[PDB]
Amino acid sequence: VGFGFIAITLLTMFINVGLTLKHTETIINKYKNYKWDSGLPTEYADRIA
Amino acid sequence: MKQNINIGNVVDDGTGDYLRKGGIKINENFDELYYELGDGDVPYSAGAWKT
């Protein structure tokens, strides 16, 4: 008693961004690069258009 | 010296030459053929003369 007081109000917000973020899945690939600079020799043929 | 790049006959035939040997068979053929008139960088519609 005997005192007033003055009141300012505030607010905060608590939010998860990251839980949604993840890495889904990772994949890779196997390739045969045609550079020239080769002989055939092993095997033959095989895949034929 | 035309440096004919050869294929064996029909497609699918195990014979051929090479994509490797074609290399420089292809390229010299250019060079040889081209460097005649093309004489390095640019071919000359006025022709190439080599002193």
UniProtKB/Swiss-Prot annotation, chain A:
It is found in: Virion. Belongs to the T4likevirus baseplate wedge protein gp7 family. Intermediate/inner baseplate protein. The gp25-(gp6)2-gp7 module is involved in sheath contraction. Involved in the tail assembly. Heterotrimer with gp6; assembles as a (gp6)2-gp7 heterotrimeric molecule. The (gp6)2-gp7 heterotrimeric molecule further interacts with gp25 and gp53. The gp25-(gp6)2-gp7 module is involved in sheath contraction. Interacts with gp8. Binds to gp10 homotrimer; disulfide-linked. Heteromultimer with gp10; a gp10 molecule is disulfide-linked to gp7 and the other two remaining gp10 molecules form a disulfide bond. This is Baseplate wedge protein gp7. It comes from Enterobacteria phage T4 (Bacteriophage T4). The gene is 7.
UniProtKB/Swiss-Prot annotation, chain B:
It comes from the Viruses. It is found in: Virion. Induction: Expressed in the late phase of the viral replicative cycle. Peripheral baseplate protein that is part of the tail fiber network. Connects the short tail fibers to the baseplate. During infection, the baseplate undergoes a conformational change from a dome-shaped to a star-shaped structure. At this point, gp10 rotates and acts as a lever that unfolds the short tail fibers, which then interact with host cell surface receptors. Involved in the tail assembly. Homotrimer; disulfide-linked. Heteromultimer with gp7; a gp10 molecule is disulfide-linked to gp7 and the other two remaining gp10 molecules form a disulfide bond. The gp10 trimer interacts with gp11 trimer and with the short tail fiber (STF) composed of the gp12 trimer. Part of the baseplate macromolecular complex which consists of gp5, gp5.4, gp27 (central spike complex); gp6, gp25, gp53 (inner baseplate); gp7, gp8 (intermediate baseplate); gp9, gp10, gp11, gp12 (peripheral); gp48 and gp54 (proximal region of the tail tube). Belongs to the T4likevirus baseplate wedge protein gp10 family. This is Baseplate wedge protein gp10. It comes from Enterobacteria phage T4. The chain holds residues 1 to 51 of 602 of the full protein.
